[PDB]
């Protein structure tokens, strides 16, 4: 797991940017799928264009060799393959493509590349969206809304995750509860609750409750419920070592946990978003994509990421007679999904309003 620290720092730089944009919308994205997509894309780039991408993924190219970077990602794909994800490359049908790139995309990163007639904008937009919808079986519809006029290369990265808890909730105990969108305003949401033994603890550094729940597939969801007026403090203080320390501890205590059902999405323009992380040339006219096509000019004019999450109710636990704490996730909270093997950040998000 040599590239795990870089993924974690890429997750945070990506999160802190989205949280800076707007603080009133739900955030949810996959650092792993985005970084894998652009690490794979780098195989067809050279020189500054190539360096901007790996550096943009938080890889110090003067310290870690690229062989380890791609080896780390491919070793992560072997682990990762209910999680449905896909990355589609759509290239203009008039381009002479380099076989090496198409091999690397299919063999090494297990991704898909298609040739499109970008002369028909509406039909290109349809084939792109039909591909996503077919890969998510209708969960993600009409992803791409528009295409630039000079579009000759589009990238689409989708991921849909349905969480199956190790310790499930009982549907009969789910009912409507207030969700405090702020200190004086509430909104009713469906709220799951269970009295049991949880990996839960209040953290002084983070000023937050920290809940860890395993789900089926050797991965763990970490929820950070900040104290009153501590959301910004929580987001600033999060580090990979703090997260790793929590994964190490397995001690449980009793609590009456209230956790809302979640059906949230995140749709992001990777050209805009990754542009503020330093990845700009691959989207510009001076892009060195000579590993993709050898003679014609090429640039990535479209890159979209959509991530969809479903949290619901989806072994006997002995509960002491002491008064259990009441931990309600009824206000904005931060969360991550961590793969247990590689410790890599599968997903990261913030719920400002489950009903949004």
From Swiss-Prot:
It is linked to Alpha-1-antitrypsin deficiency: A disorder whose most common manifestation is emphysema, which becomes evident by the third to fourth decade. A less common manifestation of the deficiency is liver disease, which occurs in children and adults, and may result in cirrhosis and liver failure. Environmental factors, particularly cigarette smoking, greatly increase the risk of emphysema at an earlier age. It is found in: Secreted; Endoplasmic reticulum. GO terms for molecular function: identical protein binding; protease binding; serine-type endopeptidase inhibitor activity. The record marks 321-322 as: Reactive bond. This is Alpha-1-antitrypsin. Changing residue 44 to E: In M-Mineral springs; causes reduced AAT secretion. Changing residue 325 to T: In L-Offenbach. GO terms for cellular component: collagen-containing extracellular matrix; COPII-coated ER to Golgi transport vesicle; endoplasmic reticulum; endoplasmic reticulum lumen; endoplasmic reticulum-Golgi intermediate compartment membrane; extracellular exosome; extracellular region; extracellular space. Inhibitor of serine proteases. Its primary target is elastase, but it also has a moderate affinity for plasmin and thrombin. Irreversibly inhibits trypsin, chymotrypsin and plasminogen activator. The aberrant form inhibits insulin-induced NO synthesis in platelets, decreases coagulation time and has proteolytic activity against insulin and plasmin. Keywords: Acute phase, Blood coagulation, Endoplasmic reticulum, Extracellular matrix, Glycoprotein, Hemostasis, Phosphoprotein, Protease inhibitor, Secreted, Serine protease inhibitor, Signal. The modification Phosphoserine is found at residue 322. Residues 315-331 are annotated as: RCL. Changing residue 45 to I: In QO-Lisbon; deficient AAT with very low serum levels. SUPFAM superfamilies: Serpins. It comes from Homo sapiens (Human). Changing residue 86 to S: In QO-Newport. N-glycosylated. Differential glycosylation produces a number of isoforms. N-linked glycan at Asn-60 is alternatively di-antennary, tri-antennary or tetra-antennary. The glycan at Asn-23 is di-antennary with trace amounts of tri-antennary. Glycan at Asn-218 is exclusively di-antennary. Structure of glycans at Asn-23 and Asn-218 is Hex5HexNAc4. The structure of the antennae is Neu5Ac(alpha1-6)Gal(beta1-4)GlcNAc attached to the core structure Man(alpha1-6)[Man(alpha1-3)]Man(beta1-4)GlcNAc(beta1-4)GlcNAc. Some antennae are fucosylated, which forms a Lewis-X determinant. (Microbial infection) Proteolytically processed by Staphylococcus aureus seryl, cysteinyl, and metallo-proteases. It holds the Pfam family Serpin. Glycans are attached at residues 23, 60, 218. PROSITE patterns: SERPIN (PS00284). The aberrant form is found in the plasma of chronic smokers, and persists after smoking is ceased. It can still be found ten years after smoking has ceased. InterPro entries: Serpin_CS (IPR023795), Serpin_dom (IPR023796), Serpin_fam (IPR000215), Serpin_sf (IPR036186), Serpin_sf_1 (IPR042178), Serpin_sf_2 (IPR042185). Changing residue 69 to N: In QO-Ludwigshafen. Its main location: secreted. The record marks 299-302 as: (Microbial infection) Cleavage.
